[PDB]
């Protein structure tokens, strides 16, 4: 029933992947060989298979039950999966782990703020994500997923670096905890009613200001 | 006679073609149904 859009064929298997998180391998008869499904994974747009042709252990091994009348050993190449929502994963060929890699902003992008005394940089999307990196380490670290469907664009540190702040296209402003990205104010401040367009702190931590696209 | 025979023969032939197409697509529908049932059965083993 569900929408398919991926199709590639490996070493006399066919492989097919779906809008909603089910990936299937077939033999040229269109016979059914065991699938991968229902992980936190969907709309798989990137499939790819290893350069390495698999060497074949069998003395101890983890292979899934194929659906033949008997149901035999089954050893693909290694192969790569990735979603619509920009989520990148590698599978151990033996299935024992579905391992995810970097995970990245879904859609459109807006500019990042640096901590003034620490090698930390914060990135945010339009959608649902603000995340911080140590740009020396090149290491993905702390990040908080934001409430659904709010657009977000503006980001700031206070001059101490102790505070982080972000601006949201639907009339919405948060102050953030430069550690946990807790919503510092028990609710955010939602006084305006359209997109932010700037935010800044004073030299005094006590004061912060924003512009909105209504010229207010 | 010769003409009327030829014409009626051609008409018969045309309907023969109609029947041939009809049965051909009927068997294609059969093949579809079998393919579905194969998939169902192969899946059904998985749980056991």
Percent helix, strand, coil in chain A, to 5, is 0, 50, 50
Distance of residue A67 Cα from the nearest chain B Cα, in angstroms = 5
Question: Resolution, in Å, please?
Answer: 4.7
The CA distances from residue A206 to A38, A142, A173, A209, in Å, are 48, 25, 16, 11
Interface test with B, best of A32, A38, A70, A72 (most B CBs within 10 A): A32
Structure tokens that stand for B30 in this block? 């059969």
Residues of chain B neighbouring A30 (CB-CB closer than 8 A): 35
Chain A CA closest to residue B32: A30
Task: List helix spans (H) across A110-179.
Answer: none
| E strand spans, A38-191 | 46-49, 79-82, 87-91, 98-103, 109-114, 120-125, 129-134, 139-145, 152-157, 163-168, 172-177
Chain B contact for A4, CB < 8 A?
A: no
Residues of chain A neighbouring B35 (CB-CB closer than 8 A): 30
Q: Are the Cβ atoms of A32 and B35 closer than 8 angstroms? A: no
* Cα–Cα distance for residue pair A17/A21, rounded to 1 Å: 7
């Amino acid at each position: 029933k569900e929408a398919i859009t991926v199709l590639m064929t490996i070493d006399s298997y066919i492989v097919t992947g779906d809008i909603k998180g089910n990936i299937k391998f077939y033999d040229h008869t269109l016979s059914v060989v065991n699938w991968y499904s229902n992980f936190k994974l969907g709309a798989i747009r990137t499939l790819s298979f290893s350069k390495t042709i698999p060497s074949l252990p069998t003395e101890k091994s983890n292979l899934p039950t194929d659906c033949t009348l008997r149901g035999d050993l089954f050893v693909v190449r290694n192969f790569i999966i990735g979603t619509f929502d920009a989520t990148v994963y590698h599978m151990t060929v033996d299935g024992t782990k579905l391992e995810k890699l970097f995970v990245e902003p879904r859609d459109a992008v807006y500019a990042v703020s640096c901590h003034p005394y620490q090698p930390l940089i914060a990135v945010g999307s339009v959608c649902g994500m603000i995340k911080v990196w140590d740009f020396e380490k090149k290491v993905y670290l702390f990040s908080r997923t934001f409430e659904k469907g709010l657009g977000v664009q503006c980001l700031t540190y206070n001059p101490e670096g102790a505070l982080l702040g972000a601006g949201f296209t639907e009339g919405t402003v948060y102050i953030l905890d430069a550690m946990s990205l807790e919503n510092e104010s028990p609710e955010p401040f939602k006084y305006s009613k359209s997109s932010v367009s700037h935010c800044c702190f004073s030299h005094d931590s006590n004061y912060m200001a924003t512009a909105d696209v209504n010229f207010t | 006679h010769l003409e009327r025979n030829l014409a009626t023969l051609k008409k018969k032939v045309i309907k023969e073609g109609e029947l041939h197409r009809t049965d051909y697509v009927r068997i294609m529908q059969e093949n579809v149904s079998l393919i579905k049932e194969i998939n169902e059965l192969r899946r059904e083993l998985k749980l056991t």
